[PDB]
Coordinates of N, CA and C and ligand atoms in Angstrom, one line a residue:
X1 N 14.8 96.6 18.9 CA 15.3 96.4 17.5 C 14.3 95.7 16.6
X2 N 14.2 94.6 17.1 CA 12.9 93.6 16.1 C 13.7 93.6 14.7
X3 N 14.7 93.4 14.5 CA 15.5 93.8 13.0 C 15.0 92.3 12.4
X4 N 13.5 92.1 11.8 CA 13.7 90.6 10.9 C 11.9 91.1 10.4
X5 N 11.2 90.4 11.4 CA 9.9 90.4 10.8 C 9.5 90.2 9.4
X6 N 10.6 89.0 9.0 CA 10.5 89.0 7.5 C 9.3 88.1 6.6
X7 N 7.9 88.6 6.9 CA 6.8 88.6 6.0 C 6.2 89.2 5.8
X8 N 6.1 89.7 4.7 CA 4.9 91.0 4.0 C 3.9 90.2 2.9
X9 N 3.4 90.7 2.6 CA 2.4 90.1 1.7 C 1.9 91.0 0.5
X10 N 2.2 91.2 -0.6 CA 1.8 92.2 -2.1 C 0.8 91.4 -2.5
X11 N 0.0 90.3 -2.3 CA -1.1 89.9 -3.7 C -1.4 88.7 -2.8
X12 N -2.6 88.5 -3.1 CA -3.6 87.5 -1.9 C -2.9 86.0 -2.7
X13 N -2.8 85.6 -3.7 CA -2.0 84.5 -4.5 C -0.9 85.2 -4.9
X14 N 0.5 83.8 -4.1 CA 2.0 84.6 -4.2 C 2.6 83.0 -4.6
X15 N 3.6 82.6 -5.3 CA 4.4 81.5 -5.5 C 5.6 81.6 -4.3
X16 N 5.5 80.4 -4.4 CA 6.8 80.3 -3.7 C 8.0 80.0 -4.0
X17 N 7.7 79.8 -5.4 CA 9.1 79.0 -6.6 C 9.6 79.9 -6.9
X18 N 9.3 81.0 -7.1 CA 10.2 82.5 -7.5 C 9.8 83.4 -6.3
X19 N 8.3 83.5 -5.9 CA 8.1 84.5 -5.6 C 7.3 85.8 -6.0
X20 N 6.4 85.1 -6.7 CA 5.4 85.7 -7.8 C 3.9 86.2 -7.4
X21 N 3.5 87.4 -7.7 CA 2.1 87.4 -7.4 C 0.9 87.5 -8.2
X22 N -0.7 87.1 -7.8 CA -1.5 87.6 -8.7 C -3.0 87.7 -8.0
X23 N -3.7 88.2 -8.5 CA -4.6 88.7 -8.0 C -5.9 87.6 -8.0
X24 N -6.3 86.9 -9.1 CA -7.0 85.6 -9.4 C -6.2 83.9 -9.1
X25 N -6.6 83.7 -8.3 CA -5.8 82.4 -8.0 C -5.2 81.3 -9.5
X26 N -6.3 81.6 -10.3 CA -6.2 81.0 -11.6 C -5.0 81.6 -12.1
X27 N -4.9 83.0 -12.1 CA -3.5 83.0 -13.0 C -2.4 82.8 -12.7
X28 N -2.1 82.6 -10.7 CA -0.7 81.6 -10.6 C -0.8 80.6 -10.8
X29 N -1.9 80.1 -11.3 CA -2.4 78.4 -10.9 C -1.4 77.9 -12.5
X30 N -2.0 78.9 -13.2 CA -1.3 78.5 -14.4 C 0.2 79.3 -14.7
X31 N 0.3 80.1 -14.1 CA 1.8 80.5 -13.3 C 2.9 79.1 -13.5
X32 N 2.6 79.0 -11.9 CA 3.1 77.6 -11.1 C 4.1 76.6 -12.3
X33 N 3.0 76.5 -13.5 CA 2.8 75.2 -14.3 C 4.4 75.9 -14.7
X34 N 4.6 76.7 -14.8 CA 6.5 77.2 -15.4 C 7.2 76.4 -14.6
X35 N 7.0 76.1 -13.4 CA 8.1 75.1 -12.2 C 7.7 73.7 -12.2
X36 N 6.4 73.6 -12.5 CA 6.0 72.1 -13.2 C 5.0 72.0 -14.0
X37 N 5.5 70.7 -14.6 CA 4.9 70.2 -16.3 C 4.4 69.3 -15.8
X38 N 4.6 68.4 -16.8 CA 3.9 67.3 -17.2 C 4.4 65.9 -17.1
X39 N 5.6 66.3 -16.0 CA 6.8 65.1 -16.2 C 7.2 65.1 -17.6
X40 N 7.6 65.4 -18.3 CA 8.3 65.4 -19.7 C 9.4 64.9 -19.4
X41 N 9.4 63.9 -20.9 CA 10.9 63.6 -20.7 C 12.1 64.6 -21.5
X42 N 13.1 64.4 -20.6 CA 14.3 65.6 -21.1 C 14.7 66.0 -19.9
X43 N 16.4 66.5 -20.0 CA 17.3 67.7 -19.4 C 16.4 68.5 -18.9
X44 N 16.4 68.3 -17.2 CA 15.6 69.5 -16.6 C 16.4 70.1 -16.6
X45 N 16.6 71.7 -17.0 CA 17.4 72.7 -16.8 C 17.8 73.2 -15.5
X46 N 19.1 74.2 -15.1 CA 19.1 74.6 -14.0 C 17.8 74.7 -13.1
Ligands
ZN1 ZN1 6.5 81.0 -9.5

């Protein structure tokens, strides 16, 4: 059966906060930055 083996890999840089890929490590890097800021103050949203 083996029914799981659940890791694949689409893009050499992948997030882990959604699940996102990209090809230059720089553009999740600046990705990322959507799941964290800058400590701001305010209502973190859902
Ligand atoms: Zn992400």
């Amino acid at each position: 059966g083996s029914s799981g083996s659940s890791g694949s890999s689409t893009k050499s840089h992948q997030c882990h906060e959604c699940g996102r890929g990209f090809t230059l490590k720089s553009h999740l890097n600046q990705h990322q930055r959507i799941h964290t800021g800058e400590k701001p103050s305010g209502p973190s949203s859902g």
